[PDB]
Write a protein that binds this ligand. Sequence first.
Ligand SMILES: O=C(O)c1ccc(Cl)c(Cl)c1
Length: 119
Amino acid sequence: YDIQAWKKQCEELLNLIFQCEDSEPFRQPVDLLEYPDYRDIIDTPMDFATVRETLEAGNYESPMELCKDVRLIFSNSKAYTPSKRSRIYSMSLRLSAFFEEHISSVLSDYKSALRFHKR
Ligand SMILES: O=C(O)c1ccc(Cl)c(Cl)c1
């Protein structure tokens, strides 16, 4: 019932994501020189370094907020992809499945801890 445990759990999960080859296109903001029309389609860029920095700055209040920003990385890749078969989009799908598989217990434990706190 540790209400703060999610933060280190998210740091460790981000470490695993940064080790995944599939995260390379998503570690830093999308390069506008390589994809000049990016901001015409994507309103809110997001990347894993921004997520990690936000977490480390103490600017997430809950793992739900972190999860919303990670999911935005994946929805931006889906919105920008020219094809559902593209290389970068396929990497995003594998990374999303890995992230969802690991974030589920983090969210469950946090929500359970809050409910215990307010019992
Ligand atoms: O060229 C592509 O397939 C491509 C380039 C950049 C992104 Cl973010 C995505 Cl999802 C796809």
